[PDB]
Every structure is written in C-alpha cells, then in structure tokens.
Design a binder for this molecule. Structure first.
Ligand SMILES: CCCCCCCCCCCCCCCCCC(=O)OC[C@H](COP(=O)(O)OCCN)OC(=O)CCCCCCCCCCCCCCCCC
Ligand SMILES: CCCCCCCCCCCC(=O)OC[C@H](COP(=O)(O)OCC[N+](C)(C)C)OC(=O)CCCCCCCCCCC
Ligand SMILES: CCCCCCCCCCCC(=O)OC[C@H](COP(=O)(O)OCC[N+](C)(C)C)OC(=O)CCCCCCCCCCC
Ligand SMILES: CCCCCCCCCCCC(=O)OC[C@H](COP(=O)(O)OCC[N+](C)(C)C)OC(=O)CCCCCCCCCCC
Ligand code: SF4
Ligand code: SF4
Lengths: 233, 239, 121, 190, 61, 123, 63, 181
C-alpha cells in the first residue's frame, strides 16, 4: 500500500496549487505551440509509422504519437483509475510535434485527475489491513505482544511471497513500464527484471534517425526522453 | 474580486465519518471468469500447433506457452500473424537460470496484442552452450532485448546481427546475472599512479558483504493454496 | 495477377504509414479466396488449424459480400479500419503459406525432460 | 450479434475515420490575411510579449544561508542516537536497524555491560553508503536512532564521514531540542 | 475508527481550470496591414518632401 | 537497428568442426592484420610483435578443446572481442588488461618454493 | 557574384541625382538582368542539402 | 466549459491591487491569469510541525478487520489462499479430449475408467491421434467456438473508445492531435 498517512493540511494545499498551475501551463504553451521556429524544428522530424511502432515495442507517448489508441490506465486499468474520469490525447502523424502536443494535453488531463481525486477522497486505512505483510503502527507494537512479534519479524526476515511469476506493466509517463518478478517462495525475489520504456525507445533510435540532419538528431532524443536510469540499470 | 477578500479553505466544514466500512473479498475472485476464458483460448492454441507447444500454464490472468527452442520461430510467427492472436508488440524478453536443471536457462518472451488488449508469454530453454533461435527476423525491436539476455546470462540467439555485450564493461569476463557469479564480482578498479592509468585488480573489500539470508524461516510460510482451475478443464473422476 | 494490400502514400488516415486504399473489397475478396484455396489445397482436413481458418475466412468473406458500404462492414468485421483488415488478410495468407512448409499438425519432435519445468512447487 | 473471431465488441469508434485535409482553396482565410501573419511574424510577437510580461513580476529566489526552504518533520538528513530523560543511551542493541538497512550501512557489536543491561559496545554508520530511506528509524522499537533534518554537514575527507557511536551520540545530544519538534508532529502518523 | 486525518470538504472544492486558455487576441491581419501601409506611406510623404526641400536648398547654396 | 555495425557478423553456429576451423583461421588473420592499428589506436609503449605474440598466445590457450559447441561459444566470444578492439570502443585501460605481465615488475620476493609461500602464507 | 553586384550599386546610389531618368533605367535593366540569374538559382533548388532517406513511398503489392 | 476559464480572484495567487490592476487588464493577453506566487497567509500556514490535527490523530481502520471479537485471521487471510499455476502438459489435454471433464464426464465404468485413465497417463494415446479420434461436435464444443470459429485472444475488461470531436475536445480542428476518451 502506502508508507503512511497524509500530513494534516495537504489536501487544502494541492487545490491551491492546481488553481494557478492551470494558467502557468498555458503560459508555457504560448511561446512553443505556435512558435514557427519551434514548429519548423519539429514537424516532420522523428516520424514513426503505426505499424513499426508496434514492431519496435514502442509505447506511451510514442505509440500514441502514431495514431494508435492505447494506454494502460484506460485499457487495463488499476489503482482507482476506473473511478476517475479523464480523456486521452492521441496524435495523428508520427512526428515530434504530435508527441509534443500529447504531452501538453496530458498535463491538462493529469490536473483533471488531481482535482477529481481531491474532491473524491475517502476516509479509512492507508495500509493493507493485516500485520503479516506490513508493520503495525507504533501505538500498537509498544503494547501488543502479537504486534511486537510481527514488527520484529517483518524487518529482520520480511514477509514471504507465494511462489510464482508475474509480469506487471503500468503506464509511466515515459511509456509502458513493466517488471517481471519470479518469486521462489522465499523472502528475497528469485529474479527481478525491469522493462524500462526508454530502453526500447533508444533501441529504436537507428530506425528513425536514418536520413535526418545532425541538429534533428537532438530533437528526437527529447521526444523519446531518455533519463538513462531507464536505459541501463 | 480581490486577493485580499478571497476565502480561506482551512476554515471549512470537512467530511467526517464515524466509522469506515470496507468489505473483505479475495482479490483472485475477480479474475476467475476471464481465467476460464484464458484456459479455453490456450486449449485451442495447443490444438492448433500440436507439433510445437509442449505445454501451457495459466496462473491468474496470465498465459504462458511452454515451447521448445527449435520450435520458437514457428510459434512466434503464428502469434504475430494469426488474426485471432495478432501479438504485434514485443515487450520484454529475458532469461532465468535454474542451476538444478539440465538445461540451465529458460528464456521468456512477453508479447502484447494492442488490438485485442491481451498479453502472452512464451517460455523456451537453453543450456549455457546450446542456442535459442533469434526472433529479430520478425521483430526489429527484439534484438537489443536479446542482446541484454546475452550479456547477463550468456544465452545465444543464432541468426543475430551484432550479438555482443551491452551494459557491461568492455573487457568484462563473466556473465553477471548468474548464480555462480558472486555479488561483488572478481575485479576492482583503481588509479595506478605509476602507470598513470586505471588498473584492474583482483577484488578486495574494506567491509565484507554480509548476507542475512542465512537466518530465514524454518517453518514453511504459505500453504499450498486453492485452485482456480474451472471444472471444465480438469480430468473427470470416474463414476 | 497482383493485388494491392497497403497504400504507403495517398489520402491520409488516422494511423501513420497507412493511407486510404482505393477499392478495398475486391482486394479483400481476392485475398480471402486465395487463402481458402491455398488452405484447402495444402492442409489435412483433420487439422484444427485448417478447420478454424476455413470457418474464419468464410465468416469474414460472407460479411464482406453481404453489406455494400465500407463502414458498415468495418463495424461488423470487428478489426480496425479496412486498410488494416486487408493487411491482416494478407498476413493470414502468408501465415497459411508458411504453415504447409512447417507442417505443424505432426506430433511434437522435442519432448522435454522432467527436471525441465518445475517451479519451486 | 455473434462476432467473427479476431473480433470483439472493440470495433472502430463512431468517427474514427479522418476527414480529408483541406486544400488551399477551401480555406476561410484570404491569402492577404494569411500572409500578413506570415510576413509580420504574428505569433512570434505573441510569444515575445509573454516573456515581456514576465520581466515585470516577482522572482522566486530565496537567499540560501539566510533563508531556508521547506521543512516537513518527516524529512531526513544526518543520523542521531537519542537519549532518555535523565540520560540513558536508548540503544538496546536489538540489531533491527542493521537487519533492515537496504545498503548495509549499519554495523553493530553488542555486549552485556557491567550493570547487566544490554547495550551496544560498537555502533557505526557509513554515511558514504547510506541512502536515507528511513528504515532504520522506522524499525527501532525504542526509537533510539532518528534522522535529524540537518543536511548541512558536508565534509572534506572520507574518514570524517564514517560516524561511530560517539559522533552519533553527540548528534543526538545536539539536535535533541529539534527532534522534540519533529517527533511531536510525526509520532501519531508513524 | 478514523480520527484526525486529512479529509476533503463537506461540499468539495470548486472546479479548477484544466482547459486550454488561449484566446485569440489582436486585430484582424488586414487591420495590421492597413496600419502598416498607412504608417509607411506617411513616412514616404515626409521623406520625399524633405528630399525635395534639400534639393531646393542645394540650388540656393 | 536494421543496419548493423561495420565489423559485424551474424552469429551462426557450425555443425562441422572443419568449417569452424576455417572461421578460426580467418579470425586469426583479421586479428593480426589489425595489430598495427591497435598499436596506433591505443598509444602503447611497446611494438607490434608483442600484440602479435599475445594474439598467438591467446589462441594457443584454447587449442586442445574437443567439443564443437564449446568451440562455437569460444569463436563467438573471440569475434566480439575483435569487433570491440577494431572499432575503438575499448579504451587503453581495458586494452592493457591483456598485458598484466608487461607493464611493470610487481616487486621482489616472488614465492616459488613451499617455504617462501609459507612465510607469507600465500599472501 | 551577388556581393560584386551590391558594390556595383554603390557607384550608382552616389550619382543618383546627376543621372536622373536615364541612369535610373540603366540601373533597372542591370538589376533585372541579375534578378533573372537569381530566379535561375532558386528555380533549380541549388542551395538545398536534401535528405537522402524518404518514407519509401512505394506501395505494398503482392504475388 | 465545466473546466473552462475562471477569473483570477478564485486562483489563490498574490495578483495585484489598486489602479495597477486596471493597467494590467489592458496590458495583458488573457486578464484571468495568475502571477505564480502563492498567497502567504493561506499557502502553508500553519507549518507542518505545528498542527492542532497532529495531537488528535488516531490510526485508521475498517470495520470487519479492526473488529475485536468476531473475525479470526484465517477467514480474512488471502496470502495463504493464493492460487497456483495450472500447468498442463499435452497428455493431460489428451486426457481432457478423450475422457472428458468434470463438467462433461464421458466416462462410464468407474472401475474400468481408472484403467482407461491409466494408459493415457502412461502415454498410450498421442495427441494428434486424440484430435483424429474425437467427434466433430467435441471439436466444435471444447476446442473451438460453438459456431466453429477460433476463440479470440481474451481481454479482462474491454475498452470501447469514443472520440470527442466538438468543442469539448482539447484541441480545436486544425491541430493534428485528437481526444479519444
Ligand atoms: C502582407 C505583408 C506585407 C507584404 C509585403 C511583403 C513583405 C514586407 C514585409 C517584410 C518584412 C519581412 C520580415 C521577415 C520575414 C520573415 C518571413 C518568415 O516568416 O520566414 C519564414 C521562414 C520559413 O518559411 P516556411 O518554411 O515557409 O515556414 C513558415 C511558417 N508558415 O521562417 C524561418 O526560416 C525562420 C523565421 C525567423 C523569424 C525571425 C526569428 C528571430 C527574430 C525575431 C525578431 C523580432 C523583432 C522584435 C524586436 C522588438 C523590439 C521592440
Ligand atoms: C515603441 C514602438 C513599438 C511599439 C510596438 C508596436 C506597436 C503595437 C502593435 C501591437 C499592439 C497593438 O496595438 O495590438 C492591439 C490589440 C487589440 O486587440 P483586441 O481588440 O483587444 O482583441 C480582442 C480579443 N478578445 C476578445 C479575446 C479579448 O492587442 C492588444 O491591445 C493587447 C495589448 C498590446 C500591448 C502593446 C504592447 C506594448 C505594451 C506597452 C504599451 C504601449
Ligand atoms: C516593448 C513592446 C513589445 C510589443 C510586443 C508585441 C505585442 C504583440 C501583441 C500580440 C499580437 C497579436 O495578437 O496580433 C494578432 C493578429 C492575428 O490575429 P488572428 O490570430 O488572425 O485572429 C483572427 C480573429 N480575430 C482578429 C477576430 C481575433 O496578428 C496579425 O495579423 C499581425 C500582427 C503583427 C503585429 C506586429 C507589430 C510589429 C510590426 C513591425 C513591422
Ligand atoms: C509604387 C507606389 C506608388 C504609390 C502611389 C500613391 C499615391 C499617393 C499620391 C499623393 C500625392 C502627394 O500628396 O504628394 C505630396 C508629397 C509631398 O510633396 P510636396 O513637397 O509638398 O510638393 C511640393 C510641390 N511644389 C514643389 C511644386 C511646391 O510628395 C510625395 O512624394 C509623397 C506622396 C504620398 C506618399 C506616397 C507613398 C509611396 C510609397 C511607395 C512605397 C511602395
Ligand atoms: S538503534 Fe534501534 S534498531 Fe538500532 S540497535 Fe538500537 S534499538 Fe535496535
Ligand atoms: S536511513 Fe536507510 S540506509 Fe541509512 S542507516 Fe537508516 S536504514 Fe540504513
């Protein structure tokens, strides 16, 4: 679940932030979206067709740059994205310009999530209910014998995961990011593997950057958005 | 109409519950119907390619086809091209070594059909010396993935342009993600002042690595668990 | 004779790389008939593979010959646009051509060992 | 109905067909209107006027050693071994902070002292391999080690950056008035 | 039970702005072109007048 | 990545021992043709026949290997090594991994006997 | 050759009063003769560096 | 238009006062734009180490879990109620094709049905032999769809798209990006 509960007055503060971030973003939008220099630098740069966007394994803003309506939080939803209403931007030409426009719109959609989630926040527990996978609170483990036993064991040994394998993918803002973890049945993972989006984006670099000029080899790095914690680990 | 006369929201009547009501339910119960669907789909695929599909496993919302190594290119082709499957996007391929098996590595392949919104896994096997055939013939995004599975595990992909190491040191001898390879490795780096270069030396630590895996449980922590195999896909008891 | 499957320039379309394809349903029908002829030619009729792609291309061919507008059929077909559907029918045609060289209705040639495929109970 | 096979109810949506892009002759703007915006750089000037507006507003810069930025009490900086009221070391050598530490920074040796009480002989943190996860503070039942919000302790040698028991007891001495403020606001939330 | 948490308001917050606020500003482009031609033509009036005066001054000298 | 690197080879496994012997001798020829560009490229102290004797010595390490698959894995590792060395990707500090013996004398007191191994308990 | 034209205008614009109505037309003819070589240059697309790889426009035919 | 332009007195930002605001509504692109700087008496007062809500906080709970007396843990444990991977070889699929199912038992002779199980468990039959032996409506019942079609690759929750194209869209027409919902 979550590490601990929110502080005492933060829900009233994210609202106060969002009220002004709505215009702080339109302001950044104005000197780039219809800048003719920013336009000419990225209009037919980095074009990927929708059929080889699948063959390269591209996802997120690069797959939706090419016209394909696919994102995980609508298609295979998780973590209370069912309960929150929003729409999705998808470009039409496979270029750096539509990959820019869908980010500038995903800003807006994320702000829509934030205000819907501040309005619809319920009460209740913030961690999972049982003390065999995460710790009791310190009010309890200092007087409860069971809870002191569970607190002592979840930190020395840890909890045990049942034996199995899973590939779980969510939508990072870079793209589809997944993890393939093999559980022995022990308290250490037998195997973990991170599928980073930017690994497949940088592997796809040769396929796109053929026949571009040298300056337009730099504007295409900034659309696959390589942070390099992703690409090598 | 001012920023002086704007209302505060800290002074407000807020939500307050006496008591929270959350019903308890098994998370595996929401999958079951789709899991049954997945079973039927897999029983079709094995019936469609009996020469090439040794097995399958359905855990919970996740399908795995168990396929032999010389059987991988006829299966992936099928998964790319059949109108029912259409597993266009390569997602993630890698290896896992089980040193207790004869064929040490198993090589897993993850595919996404963005049409039908479905994932599939393909498992083959490989020894340290014997290859797996490469699917970079079909997928141009696969080869880097194959290449990473080369460097961390030593698994080969026959028919691969530019198989070499990636995300490791150039003169690195060893395959790191491998149970005989130690954690801290074999060598270390320092600046030799005499030769005015970095030298690579056998490894030595100022604090030795202390694993606390010695000291695990002596009681087996989880049961066998229940099944979500449907009654359609298990053998009938006689009478 | 020769058939067109994918326009790579022309009137633009919602997807990148694909363009609007002139006269889709003759190319569609001819692709379907090539698939059914190839498949009844070179596969044994006990095959589950052959039976299913027979019934599948027969169902799609029936839908394409019945209705006459294009976006009545692309909602009844259930795949994407008909440029996509023609690409898919071409793809199942070349899949069906490869399957008779690979011959996958046989028994499996590579049986696993039993130390193979055990996962920590 | 019944669908085909390769066919779900995920048909194309009503309106997934594009409209054909407009030619030059089917446009509402005149050539004169369109090319006045071309040669007189209209939206370039609009984006120019944006940052001109921004010249005339208040900057955000705070002056760092004279004005510090945000603090929550949850924040984590250097380490401190606290003491009881009436001065007792609190560290009952339970090895939990060592067992949980994700980067193996803690090392402890523990011996029974003359009182028969259980204390650490040796406590040590490598601050070069510390990662500030706070698990060592979350784990301690006595709440003996904490994270003070000090981040301003930057050193010049590695030897200075290896904190034994004595440096951490001096830290828990020095920051104790502050750690009162931190744990008065954190302890219910823990 | 739940006591002392951060909770939302009894009626919720009022909606923030997530649409694009890019209103089309300025005159029509033909207004700017007409003003440009008017300014430039008046400048040509004064400039060509001054050249003719300077020619008459040169005649005098 | 449809275009591959310059000194690439599609990795291909031989069912015959002799065609792998053909490929091994071709690889030795590639290495020894490239010894002078290795001497220029990595700014080395010594001269080219020491690169050539190291290439020959690294091949006489693996001469009496019988099993054909192990010789295939050996040939693939060797071609990857050639491709790294020829393309100037390896640097001088890892090019001189191959020469631990040549750079310096590491000092006195080389233990040979049991007793001078014993006096420093193999150190 | 364009730079040599720009400094060929430089004797004219100093003599502009003395050759009034006559050197005006000679300069008009001079400028237009060089405008024709310029429209040669931009009709030929001479100063472009153009990218060698297309989307490969050629369609997908079969059999 | 539910999330449309709001004026800048509902935006919690320091703004301006006096006739300087009458000057900046004439000198603006959109007059309903904030200045960026949050209102100091509103934004983060009281500071987070000084909160009256911290002394009243108690740890939260749901009812059928914090319940003191009626629940035992083995009824609401689900880590030990995990399902396992149903691993199927080819000979158990031959067994499912020839003997039947627990929904569909094609087995009489229970005493002899054990030894009818046995030879397939030994590998008497093979799988393509089972596909040839088996009926056409068992092929169209259990292997294929009841209409004879291949089963489509299953998804858990299908997503039907609905393109928003009017002025409820995020970009007006002429921009190369579309809202898909
Ligand atoms: C109908 C009108 C009148 C008719 C008479 C004919 C013309 C008379 C007026 C002449 C004045 C011309 C001024 C310069 C013309 C610039 C024209 C232009 O926009 O260049 C286009 C060029 C690329 O052309 P293209 O590929 O077709 O794409 C254009 C997108 N539509 O784009 C480019 O290559 C880059 C564009 C660079 C623009 C300059 C960028 C930096 C300089 C900014 C200067 C701003 C000055 C403000 C200073 C304020 C001081 C207080
Ligand atoms: C020093 C010599 C150089 C001077 C600069 C060049 C001349 C100016 C030409 C462009 C401006 C103009 O006059 O544009 C006039 C137009 C009028 O548009 P509207 O009718 O309000 O649109 C209505 C659209 N609604 C319905 C959406 C609202 O925009 C403006 O008022 C915007 C403010 C322009 C401020 C001028 C910038 C300089 C600030 C200092 C004040 C002098
Ligand atoms: C230090 C002082 C700094 C001044 C900074 C400049 C302020 C710019 C204000 C925004 C401009 C604007 O908004 O012009 C808007 C118009 C475009 O309107 P439209 O998009 O076609 O909408 C059409 C529908 N309407 C009109 C109903 C809304 O532009 C033009 O056609 C020409 C603008 C060129 C102005 C160049 C001035 C300098 C010229 C020098 C020679
Ligand atoms: C190719 C574009 C042709 C445009 C034609 C426009 C017709 C305007 C006629 C008005 C006549 C007038 O009012 O002119 C009067 C002015 C001043 O004259 P003055 O010194 O007071 O006269 C003294 C006569 N004495 C000596 C006998 C006493 O003289 C001019 O030169 C200015 C002409 C007006 C502006 C022309 C702008 C041309 C810009 C072209 C850039 C492309
Ligand atoms: S500081 Fe805490 S966790 Fe560490 S040994 Fe002392 S009591 Fe245990
Ligand atoms: S903060 Fe984390 S890394 Fe640092 S000593 Fe505590 S548990 Fe270890």
């Amino acid at each position: 679940g979550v590490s601990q509960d929110l502080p005492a007055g933060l829900l009233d503060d994210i609202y106060m932030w969002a009220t002004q971030f709505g215009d702080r973003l339109d302001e950044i939008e104005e000197l780039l979206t219809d800048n003719r220099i920013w336009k000419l630098r990225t209009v037919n740069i980095g074009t990927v067709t929708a059929q080889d966007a699948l063959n390269l394994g591209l996802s997120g803003p690069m797959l939706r740059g090419s016209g394909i309506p696919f994102d995980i939080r609508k298609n295979a939803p998780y973590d209370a994205y069912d309960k929150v209403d929003f729409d999705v931007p998808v470009g039409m030409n496979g270029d750096c310009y539509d990959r820019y426009l869908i980010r500038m719109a995903e800003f807006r959609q994320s702000l829509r999530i934030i205000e819907q989630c501040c309005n619809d926040m319920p009460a209740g527990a913030v961690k999972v209910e049982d003390f065999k996978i995460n710790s009791p609170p310190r009010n309890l483990m200092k007087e409860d014998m069971e809870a002191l036993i569970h607190h002592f064991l979840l930190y020395t040994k840890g909890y045990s995961v049942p034996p199995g394998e899973t590939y779980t993918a969510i939508e990072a803002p870079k793209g589809e990011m997944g993890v393939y973890v093999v559980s022995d049945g022990s308290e250490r993972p037998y195997k973990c593997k991170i599928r980073a989006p930017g690994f497949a984006h940088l592997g796809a670099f040769d396929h796109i950057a053929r026949g571009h000029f040298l300056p337009d080899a730099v504007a295409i790095i900034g659309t696959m958005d390589l942070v390099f914690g992703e690409v090598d680990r | 109409p001012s920023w002086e006369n704007i209302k505060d929201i800290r002074l407000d009547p807020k939500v307050h519950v006496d008591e929270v009501y959350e019903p308890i339910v098994n998370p595996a119960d929401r999958y079951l119907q789709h899991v049954s669907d997945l079973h039927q789909y897999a029983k079709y695929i094995m019936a469609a390619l009996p020469k090439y599909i040794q097995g399958f496993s359905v855990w919970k919302d996740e399908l795995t086809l168990h396929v032999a190594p010389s059987a991988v290119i006829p299966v992936t082709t099928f998964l790319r091209d059949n109108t029912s499957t259409q597993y266009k996007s390569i997602i993630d391929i890698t290896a896992v070594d089980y040193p207790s098996r004869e064929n040490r590595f198993e090589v897993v392949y993850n595919f996404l059909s963005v049409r039908h919104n479905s994932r599939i896994r393909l498992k083959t096997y490989a020894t340290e010396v014997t290859p797996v055939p490469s699917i970079t013939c079909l997928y141009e995004g696969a080869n880097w993935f194959e290449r990473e599975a080369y460097d961390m595990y030593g698994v080969f992909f026959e028919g691969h342009p530019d198989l070499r190491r990636i995300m490791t040191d150039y003169g690195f001898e060893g395959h790191p993600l491998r149970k005989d390879f130690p954690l801290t490795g074999y060598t270390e780096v320092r600046w030799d002042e005499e030769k005015r270069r970095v030298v690579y030396e056998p490894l030595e630590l100022t604090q030795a690595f202390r694993n606390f895996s010695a000291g695990s449980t002596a009681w087996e922590p989880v049961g066998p668990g229940r099944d979500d195999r449907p009654d359609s896909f298990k053998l009938p008891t006689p009478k | 004779q020769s058939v067109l499957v994918q326009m790579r320039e022309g009137t633009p379309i919602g997807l990148t790389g694909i363009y609007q394809h002139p006269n889709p349903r003759p190319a569609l029908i001819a692709l379907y008939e090539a698939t059914l002829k190839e498949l009844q030619d070179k596969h044994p009729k006990d095959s589950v593979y052959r039976q299913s792609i027979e019934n599948l291309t027969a169902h799609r061919k029936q839908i394409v010959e019945d209705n006459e507008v294009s976006e009545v059929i692309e909602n009844k077909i259930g795949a994407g646009l008909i440029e996509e559907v023609v690409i898919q029918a071409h793809e199942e045609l070349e899949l069906a051509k490869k399957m008779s060289e690979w011959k996958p209705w046989e028994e499996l040639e590579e049986k696993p060992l039993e130390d193979q495929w055990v996962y920590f109970n | 109905n019944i669908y085909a096979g390769g066919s779900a109810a995920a048909a194309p949506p009503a309106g997934f067909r594009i409209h054909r892009p407009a030619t030059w002759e089917e446009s509402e703007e005149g050539a004169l209107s369109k090319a006045t915006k071309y040669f007189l750089l209209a939206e370039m000037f609009r984006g120019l006027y944006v940052v001109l507006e921004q010249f005339f507003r208040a900057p955000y810069t705070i002056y760092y050693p004279f004005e510090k930025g945000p603090v929550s009490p949850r924040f984590r900086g250097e380490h401190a071994l606290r003491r009881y009221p009436s001065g007792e070391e609190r560290c009952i050598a339970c090895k939990l902070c060592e067992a949980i530490c994700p980067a193996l920074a803690i090392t402890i040796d523990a011996e029974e002292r003359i009182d028969g009480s259980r204390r650490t002989t040796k406590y040590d943190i490598d601050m070069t391999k510390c990662i500030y996860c706070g698990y060592c503070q979350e784990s301690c039942p006595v709440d003996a080690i904490v994270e003070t919000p000090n981040v301003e302790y930057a050193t010049e040698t590695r030897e200075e950056l290896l904190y034994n028991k004595e440096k951490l007891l001096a830290n828990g001495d020095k920051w104790e008035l502050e750690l009162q403020y931190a744990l008065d606001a954190d302890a219910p939330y823990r | 039970p739940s006591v002392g948490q951060d909770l939302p308001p009894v009626g919720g917050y009022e909606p923030v702005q997530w649409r694009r606020n890019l209103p089309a500003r300025g005159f029509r482009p033909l207004v700017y072109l007409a003003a440009l031609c008017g300014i430039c033509g008046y400048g040509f009036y004064r400039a060509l007048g001054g050249i003719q005066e300077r020619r008459e001054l040169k005649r005098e000298k | 990545a449809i275009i591959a690197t310059a000194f690439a080879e599609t990795v291909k496994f031989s069912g015959s021992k002799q065609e792998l012997q053909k490929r091994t001798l071709a690889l030795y020829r590639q290495f020894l043709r490239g010894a002078p560009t290795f001497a220029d490229l990595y700014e080395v102290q010594f001269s080219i026949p020491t690169i050539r004797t190291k290439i020959r010595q690294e091949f006489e390490r693996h001469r009496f290997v019988d099993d054909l698959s192990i010789q295939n894995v050996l040939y693939a590792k060797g071609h990857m090594e050639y491709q790294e060395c020829i393309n100037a990707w390896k640097q001088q500090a890892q090019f001189l991994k191959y020469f631990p013996e040549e750079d310096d004398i590491q000092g006195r007191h080389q233990p040979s006997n049991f007793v001078d191994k014993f006096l420093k308990n193999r150190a | 050759p364009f730079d040599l034209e720009i400094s060929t205008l430089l004797p004219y614009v100093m003599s502009i009063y003395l050759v009034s109505n006559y050197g005006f037309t000679i300069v008009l003819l001079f400028l237009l003769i060089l405008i024709i070589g310029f429209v040669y240059e931009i009709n030929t697309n001479a100063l472009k560096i153009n990218k060698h790889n297309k989307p490969n426009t050629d369609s997908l035919i079969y059999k | 238009l539910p999330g449309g332009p709001v004026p800048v007195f509902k935006k919690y930002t320091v703004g301006s006062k006096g006739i300087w605001e009458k000057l900046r509504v004439l000198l603006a692109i959109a007059p309903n734009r904030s200045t960026g700087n949050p209102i100091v008496p509103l934004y983060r007062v009281p500071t987070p180490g000084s909160r009256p809500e911290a002394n009243v906080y108690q740890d939260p709970s749901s009812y059928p879990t914090n319940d003191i007396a009626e629940n035992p843990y083995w009824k609401r444990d689900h880590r030990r109620a995990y399902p396992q991977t149903a691993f199927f070889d080819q000979k158990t699929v031959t067994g499912l094709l020839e003997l039947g199912s627990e929904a569909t038992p094609r087995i009489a002779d229970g005493e002899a049905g054990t030894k009818a199980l046995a030879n397939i468990a030994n590998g008497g039959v093979s799988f393509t032999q089972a596909l040839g032996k088996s009926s056409k409506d068992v092929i169209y019942g259990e292997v294929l769809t009841v209409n004879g079609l291949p089963p489509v690759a299953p998804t858990l929750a299908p997503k039907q798209w609905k393109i928003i194209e009017g002025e409820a869209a995020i970009y007006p027409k002429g921009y190369p990006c579309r809202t898909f919902h």
